[PDB]
Amino acid sequence: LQSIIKNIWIPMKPYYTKVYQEIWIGMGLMGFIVYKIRAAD
Amino acid sequence: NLFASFIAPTILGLPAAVLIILFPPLLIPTSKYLINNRLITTQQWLIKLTSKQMMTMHNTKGRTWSLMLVSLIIFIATTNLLGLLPHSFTPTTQLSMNLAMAIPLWAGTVIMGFRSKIKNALAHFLPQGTPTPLIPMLVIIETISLLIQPMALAVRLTANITAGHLLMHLIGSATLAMSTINLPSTLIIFTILILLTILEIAVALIQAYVFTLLVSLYLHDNT
Amino acid sequence: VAYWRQAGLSYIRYSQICAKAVRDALKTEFKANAEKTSGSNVKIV
Amino acid sequence: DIDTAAKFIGAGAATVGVAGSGAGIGTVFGSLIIGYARNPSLKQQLFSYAILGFALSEAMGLFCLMVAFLILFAM
Amino acid sequence: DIDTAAKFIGAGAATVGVAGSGAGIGTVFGSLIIGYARNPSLKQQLFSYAILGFALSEAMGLFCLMVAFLILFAM
Amino acid sequence: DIDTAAKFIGAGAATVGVAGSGAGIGTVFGSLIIGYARNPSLKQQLFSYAILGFALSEAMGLFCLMVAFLILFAM
Amino acid sequence: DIDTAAKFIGAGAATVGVAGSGAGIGTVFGSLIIGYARNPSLKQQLFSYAILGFALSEAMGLFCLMVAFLILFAM
Amino acid sequence: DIDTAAKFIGAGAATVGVAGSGAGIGTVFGSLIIGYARNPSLKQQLFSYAILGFALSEAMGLFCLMVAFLILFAM
Amino acid sequence: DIDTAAKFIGAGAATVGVAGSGAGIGTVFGSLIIGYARNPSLKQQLFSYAILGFALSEAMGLFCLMVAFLILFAM
Amino acid sequence: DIDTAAKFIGAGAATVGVAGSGAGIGTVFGSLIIGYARNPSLKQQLFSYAILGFALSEAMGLFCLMVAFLILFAM
Amino acid sequence: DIDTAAKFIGAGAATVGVAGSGAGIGTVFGSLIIGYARNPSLKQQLFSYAILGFALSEAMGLFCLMVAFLILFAM
Amino acid sequence: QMSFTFASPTQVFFNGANVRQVDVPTLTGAFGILAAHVPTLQVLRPGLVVVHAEDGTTSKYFVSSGSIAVNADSSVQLLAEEAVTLDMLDLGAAKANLEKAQAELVGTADEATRAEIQIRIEANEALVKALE
Amino acid sequence: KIRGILYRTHSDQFLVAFKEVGRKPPTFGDASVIALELLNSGYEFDEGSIIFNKFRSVISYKTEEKPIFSLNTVASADSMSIYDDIDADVLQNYQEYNLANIIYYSLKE
Amino acid sequence: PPLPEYGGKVRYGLIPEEFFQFLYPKTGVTGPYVLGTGLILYALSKEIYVISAETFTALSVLGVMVYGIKKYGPFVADFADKLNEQKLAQLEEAKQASIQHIQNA
Structure with missing residues (x-):
């Protein structure tokens, strides 16, 4: 629970929170697409 | 028997695609020093140059993605250039990884243009200088065009590695087949193979840079 | 390579002719002062 | 059967028609290179006409491609 | 049957013929880019000739396309 | 039967040949754009040569098209 | 029969080959437009070379067309 | 059987469509040669537009190629 | 029989390949028009290179044509 | 059998696709001629871009060719 | 039999692919005409690049042609 | 700039x-x-x-x-x-100049002087269309 | 005046002279004429220099020597590879017209 | 902390000198060589290394890489070194200037 937030999350907070929002929306879209694909098999 | 090099790898029953995909970063060491070794010297020069190339053409809201775009090009280029080693599983040849690199970024930049930029974004769906009588289905083109952007991206890589690899592979076969028949024909096929390998190096680098640049253009159009 | 070059005319002659044509096409209010502000007087020896 | 066979053949034939869009896009962006090296101060209008031409080229190419996918997977 | 099969094949073949219109439109708008970067003050006459050429290119392309749809869905 | 089937296939193949006229018309009017942006005072002679070239291109295209309609609906 | 069927198919295929002459004529007259807008005082020599190139293009196109009519109506 | 046969035929037909991307890339880099010999100081912008056009050309070419591999090895 | 049928089909296919020579000759003589309107004093050297290019284009076209006549009337 | 037959047909069709690379290489080196006659002091950069364009053209051509050899001798 | 029939069809299809080399040679020598009329003092370097481009175009064309002769007379 | x-x-x-x-x-x-x-x-x-x-x-x-x-x-x-x-x-003088110019053109028959008359004609006609 | 004072000095090296310049204010027609008879001379010079009295102001003048290039080396000059659309013809026209321009400007000076 | 002036004394870009010095006392100087050749012959003899197309694509890429090094290597080496020297000299001429500033004040 430590260092995972000290060297991994505090430098990526400005990106994961503010810059990559629509990136996460797109990742949700991609996950739905992949679920539907692997399901239709 | 032929697509074996693209079959998902495994060792001792374990999924060794993990160790393959996570390795390229291990080739970029970092340091806090000011005068460091030759490796990090050249690598920082290359990243400086690549950043100057990619991100210059953006406003600030675009330049926020500098980390993302440079990490993208570095990851893809190292993966491709690690693909050229013998008996190596190139994880870009997979459609999965490329779809997962393509749909997020493109969808993100389109939605970013939609959150802000909203009138601008719904207007760029149409070239404005267009005359009236078929403005309507013209935008149908554009809309369709838009939704083909991501797939294309992924596809645009998945082949030009896959194909490329197969390509070299087969000439290998060929020269091996001619290894026992006509020595000079073997030599000239070997020379074809050499020139081919050089072309493959170049096309690996180019495809990395191209994926990056196209995502960059979508960004700049949606900021 | 236009025709007047193949006919042998230097560009100087071309510009002379065009400027004289424009000058003769001026209204006579400006034609005189123009035509002698540009008319030549050198003699060749 | 004969029907699935002919559907495969017709899909291949239909998809042949992308070659024209490939070449048209090549020409558009080659011209753009030239027009830029000719007057590198209309970059935005040049690039706008570039996207427009590319859009129409891709319109034709995707017409062909959807026809492939219409006769293949739908009809 | 054999008739529906050949109708599918002929529709694919007929639709191949759009490639020419795709490439022709590509050329038209590439030339328009160039002609604009050459004399950016005849924009309206350049663009008029642009539409005209595009219209004839699309005339041929739609000829091909309707022939596809005539042999496919009508004959 | 086999004959109607092959007539459909041959009609599709024959109609493929309009692609060349599509591309030729594209080239003609693209060149016209360029030649106009080059010397916008021969507009009538440029446009006359334009209609002439377009006429010959359409001559070939309609040759192809009538051949389609000759083997399809007549023979 | 099978022979008339293949004759129809081969006639369509053979006639495909006009596309090249269509595009070649398009290029010839587009270049003529350009060369005229470039030096509008060699009109007769430009036009002579125009008819010459068009003649050779039509030579090839009619070769293709006669081959269509040779395999179709004669052989 | 008939199905594997038609899959081979359709794969060949589909792969025909790379010709357009080959020619489009040829045109892109030929134009790049010309635009460089015209103003050899925009090398980076010329080359960027070069990569962009080549990328779209290869986009179409790989579309065709994957369609070949989709109808051949997958469908 | 099946053999004469396939010979007809292959002859048509082989003859398709003249389209390239048609278009190549079109390009050669269009370029010649342009190069003449550009420097109308090298007429003999321009025309010599013209006949040379036309000769190679016709070399390829006649290769295709003889192949048609070889598989048709000889093999 | 039917399978070897269709493999031959598909190999021929697949190999058709080299035509695009032939024409693209023609264009690349023609443009190189022009760009050299335009500024004969960038010979090394012109020639570098020449080999690059030729390399991509041959990339597409060899894609087509190996597809021919893949469906013919391997599949 | 069916095998000789398909070999004829595949040979015709394979030989189609010369069209690209025909057009590429046409473009090469047309460009050469233009580049000569543009700077008639690099004749030897222009002509060297001419033979080089023609050589690569013929390389592709003969690839296609040998494939025709390989599937026809050898396989 | x-x-x-x-x-x-x-x-x-x-x-x-x-x-x-x-x-x-x-x-x-x-x-x-x-x-x-x-x-x-x-x-x-x-x-x-x-x-x-x-x-x-x-x-x-x-x-x-x-x-x-x-x-x-x-x-x-x-x-x-x-x-x-x-x-x-003016417009009338340009018009009359071009008219008499082409008149003399088909009148004149020597090559160099023909080119001279043609240049006068081209100047006058560029002018006549620049007029109105 | 210059022809008189240099004719017995270098008559063997002498191309042509012009008179009735100085009475009337020189114009462009002067330059067009002098350039014409400089070109119709058939003497295509490797290079040239015009020598005149650059007007500094009411009290001082400086004998200046301006250069004049030929078609050959203005074409050969690598610096001219940045300019476009140029060949023997357009550089020829430009060189002739610049000869006329520099003669006019020198007469005025 | 400073950085050592050299690396690890590798031979043939694949083997460090430690191995040669480690096998020398109990095999001599030709020992590593004979071990390598014996292992190679046993590897490609008992078909544990199948000679296939990959063998020739590997020979191609290895020839390309060895030529790439032996040609464009020293250039990249001294280029990185010149980058470093330029940065160092710039920083030193950036120290001197501020010393001069304070003295002038």
Whole structure:
């Protein structure tokens, strides 16, 4: 629970929170697409 | 028997695609020093140059993605250039990884243009200088065009590695087949193979840079 | 390579002719002062 | 059967028609290179006409491609 | 049957013929880019000739396309 | 039967040949754009040569098209 | 029969080959437009070379067309 | 059987469509040669537009190629 | 029989390949028009290179044509 | 059998696709001629871009060719 | 039999692919005409690049042609 | 960024002044010059020139035969032997001049003098269409 | 005056002279004429220099020597590879017209 | 902390000198060589290394890489070194200037 937030999350907070929002929306879209694909098999 | 090099790898029953995909970063060491070794010297020069190339053409809201775009090009280029080693599983040849690199970024930049930029974004769906009588289905083109952007991206890589690899592979076969028949024909096929390998190096680098640049253009159009 | 070059005319002659044509096409209010502000007087020896 | 066979053949034939869009896009962006090296101060209008031409080229190419996918997977 | 099969094949073949219109439109708008970067003050006459050429290119392309749809869905 | 089937296939193949006229018309009017942006005072002679070239291109295209309609609906 | 069927198919295929002459004529007259807008005082020599190139293009196109009519109506 | 046969035929037909991307890339880099010999100081912008056009050309070419591999090895 | 049928089909296919020579000759003589309107004093050297290019284009076209006549009337 | 037959047909069709690379290489080196006659002091950069364009053209051509050899001798 | 029939069809299809080399040679020598009329003092370097481009175009064309002769007379 | 120097021998209309775009009727075509235009040097032929000022308004002149030079430094020198305005010229005299010109043209038969009459004709006709 | 004062000095090296310049204010026609008879001379010079009295102001003048190039080396000059659309013809026209321009400007100076 | 002036004394870009010095006392100088050749012959003899197309694509890429090094290597080496020297000299001429500033004040 430590260092995972000290060297991994505090430098990526400005990106994961503010810059990559629509990136996460797109990742949700991609996950739905992949679920539907692997399901239709 | 032929697509074996693209079959998902495994060792001792374990999924060794993990160790393959996570390795390229291990080739970029970092340091806090000011005068460091030759490796990090050249690598920082290359990243400086690549950043100057990619991100210059953006406003600030675009330049926020500098980390993302440079990490993208570095990851893809190292993966491709690690693909050229013998008996190596190139994880870009997979459609999965490329779809997962393509749909997020493109969808993100389109939605970013939609959150802000909203009138601008719904207007760029149409070239404005267009005359009236078929403005309507013209935008149908554009809309369709838009939704083909991501797939294309992924596809645009998945082949030009896959194909490329197969390509070299087969000439290998060929020269091996001619290894026992006509020595000079073997030599000239070997020379074809050499020139081919050089072309493959170049096309690996180019495809990395191209994926990056196209995502960059979508960004700049949606900021 | 236009025709007047193949006919042998230097560009100087071309510009002379065009400027004289424009000058003769001026209204006579400006034609005189123009035509002698540009008319030549050198003699060749 | 004969029907699935002919559907495969017709899909291949239909998809042949992308070659024209490939070449048209090549020409558009080659011209753009030239027009830029000719007057590198209309970059935005040049690039706008570039996207427009590319859009129409891709319109034709995707017409062909959807026809492939219409006769293949739908009809 | 054999008739529906050949109708599918002929529709694919007929639709191949759009490639020419795709490439022709590509050329038209590439030339328009160039002609604009050459004399950016005849924009309206350049663009008029642009539409005209595009219209004839699309005339041929739609000829091909309707022939596809005539042999496919009508004959 | 086999004959109607092959007539459909041959009609599709024959109609493929309009692609060349599509591309030729594209080239003609693209060149016209360029030649106009080059010397916008021969507009009538440029446009006359334009209609002439377009006429010959359409001559070939309609040759192809009538051949389609000759083997399809007549023979 | 099978022979008339293949004759129809081969006639369509053979006639495909006009596309090249269509595009070649398009290029010839587009270049003529350009060369005229470039030096509008060699009109007769430009036009002579125009008819010459068009003649050779039509030579090839009619070769293709006669081959269509040779395999179709004669052989 | 008939199905594997038609899959081979359709794969060949589909792969025909790379010709357009080959020619489009040829045109892109030929134009790049010309635009460089015209103003050899925009090398980076010329080359960027070069990569962009080549990328779209290869986009179409790989579309065709994957369609070949989709109808051949997958469908 | 099946053999004469396939010979007809292959002859048509082989003859398709003249389209390239048609278009190549079109390009050669269009370029010649342009190069003449550009420097109308090298007429003999321009025309010599013209006949040379036309000769190679016709070399390829006649290769295709003889192949048609070889598989048709000889093999 | 039917399978070897269709493999031959598909190999021929697949190999058709080299035509695009032939024409693209023609264009690349023609443009190189022009760009050299335009500024004969960038010979090394012109020639570098020449080999690059030729390399991509041959990339597409060899894609087509190996597809021919893949469906013919391997599949 | 069916095998000789398909070999004829595949040979015709394979030989189609010369069209690209025909057009590429046409473009090469047309460009050469233009580049000569543009700077008639690099004749030897222009002509060297001419033979080089023609050589690569013929390389592709003969690839296609040998494939025709390989599937026809050898396989 | 544009350094424009439209200058007759005995007059100066611009000198380093900043304008947005100009048009020029060069022997080898009528085109437009804007900032950072690729370096060019050409000789003119009779016809209009339209300077687009930075404030958007267009000053129209009519040049007879000069020479334009667009340098690497965005400098654009346009030296025209006869620069005019468009009210300074008439229509009837230009028309009559062109008429008698082509009359003498089909009258005249020697090559060099034929070219001279043809140049007079081209100047007069560029002028007659620049008229109205 | 210059022809008189240098004719017995270098008559063997002498091409042509012009008179009735100085009475009337020189114009462009003067330059067009002098350039014409400089070109119709058939003497295509490797290079040239015009020598005149650059007006500094009312009291001082400086004997200046301006250069004049030929078609050959203005074409050969690598610096001219940045300019476009240029060949023997357009550089020829430009060189002739610049000869006329520099003669006019020198007469005025 | 400073950085050592050299690396690890590798031979043939694949083997460090530690191995040669480690096998020398109990095999001599030709020992590593004979071990390598024996292992190679046993590897490609008992078909544990199948000679296939990959063998020839590997020979191609290895020839390309060895030529790439032996040609464009020293250039990249001294280029990185010149980058470093330029940065160092710039920083030192950036120290001197501020010393001069304070003295002038």
